[PDB]
Design an enzyme around this catalytic site. Sequence first.
Site, PDB file in Angstrom:
ATOM      1  N   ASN A 165      -5.010   5.489 -17.935  1.00  0.00           N
ATOM      2  CA  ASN A 165      -3.643   5.593 -17.341  1.00  0.00           C
ATOM      3  C   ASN A 165      -3.058   6.991 -17.581  1.00  0.00           C
ATOM      4  O   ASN A 165      -3.446   7.687 -18.503  1.00  0.00           O
ATOM      5  CB  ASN A 165      -2.810   4.526 -18.061  1.00  0.00           C
ATOM      6  CG  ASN A 165      -2.858   4.746 -19.579  1.00  0.00           C
ATOM      7  OD1 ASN A 165      -1.983   5.373 -20.141  1.00  0.00           O
ATOM      8  ND2 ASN A 165      -3.854   4.255 -20.268  1.00  0.00           N
ATOM      9  N   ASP A 171       1.164   5.834 -19.084  1.00  0.00           N
ATOM     10  CA  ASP A 171       1.621   4.422 -18.861  1.00  0.00           C
ATOM     11  C   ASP A 171       1.305   3.537 -20.081  1.00  0.00           C
ATOM     12  O   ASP A 171       1.795   2.428 -20.173  1.00  0.00           O
ATOM     13  CB  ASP A 171       0.844   3.930 -17.635  1.00  0.00           C
ATOM     14  CG  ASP A 171       1.083   4.874 -16.450  1.00  0.00           C
ATOM     15  OD1 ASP A 171       2.162   4.821 -15.882  1.00  0.00           O
ATOM     16  OD2 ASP A 171       0.182   5.630 -16.131  1.00  0.00           O
ATOM     17  N   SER A 218      -1.290   1.898 -20.734  1.00  0.00           N
ATOM     18  CA  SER A 218      -2.012   0.665 -20.292  1.00  0.00           C
ATOM     19  C   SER A 218      -3.432   1.036 -19.844  1.00  0.00           C
ATOM     20  O   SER A 218      -3.677   1.334 -18.688  1.00  0.00           O
ATOM     21  CB  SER A 218      -1.190   0.106 -19.122  1.00  0.00           C
ATOM     22  OG  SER A 218      -0.928   1.140 -18.179  1.00  0.00           O
ATOM     23  N   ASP A 272      -7.263   0.062 -19.012  1.00  0.00           N
ATOM     24  CA  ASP A 272      -8.074  -1.151 -18.679  1.00  0.00           C
ATOM     25  C   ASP A 272      -9.379  -1.143 -19.477  1.00  0.00           C
ATOM     26  O   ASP A 272     -10.105  -0.168 -19.481  1.00  0.00           O
ATOM     27  CB  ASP A 272      -8.361  -1.054 -17.179  1.00  0.00           C
ATOM     28  CG  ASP A 272      -7.128  -1.502 -16.389  1.00  0.00           C
ATOM     29  OD1 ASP A 272      -6.804  -2.676 -16.449  1.00  0.00           O
ATOM     30  OD2 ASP A 272      -6.530  -0.663 -15.737  1.00  0.00           O
TER      31      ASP A 272
END
Length: 130
Positions: free
Chosen positions: A46, A49, A51, A53
Site C-alpha cells: 500500500n 494506507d 494495509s 495484503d
Amino acid sequence: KVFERCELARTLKRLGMDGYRGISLANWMCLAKWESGYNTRATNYNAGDRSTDYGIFQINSRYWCNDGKTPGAVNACHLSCSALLQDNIADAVACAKRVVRDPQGIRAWVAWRNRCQNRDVRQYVQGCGV
C-alpha cells in the site's frame, strides 16, 4: 508458495473450507486464481494506507491481521499477516474464514464478483484428483 489450481482445491479441503459458510471451494479456488494465481507467498503493498495484503487471498494488514508494526491492523483473524504468505496455509485459511464469517461472506474482494459473481466455478475443483 506459488502452487497450481488443483493444489488449492485440496489445500482448502484439507483445512475444511470445501463447502464452508454455504460457499463451495469452486468459488474459493476461482478467486485465488486472479487474487494471487494459486500463490500463498503472493502479497500486495500500500502507499500510505497501512494495509498490506498478505496470503493467497490477499488479506490487508489493517482490518484482518497485523504484519508487525501496523497500527490500523484491527486483528480480526488475530494472527501475523506474514504467516499468510508463509508456506503454512493455516493462517491464510483461518484469516480467510474470518473474512467470510462476516455478513458479506465471499464478497469482500471485487475480483470475486467480477469473474466469479454467482458464476459456474464448479469446474475449478471438479476433476482435480483428491
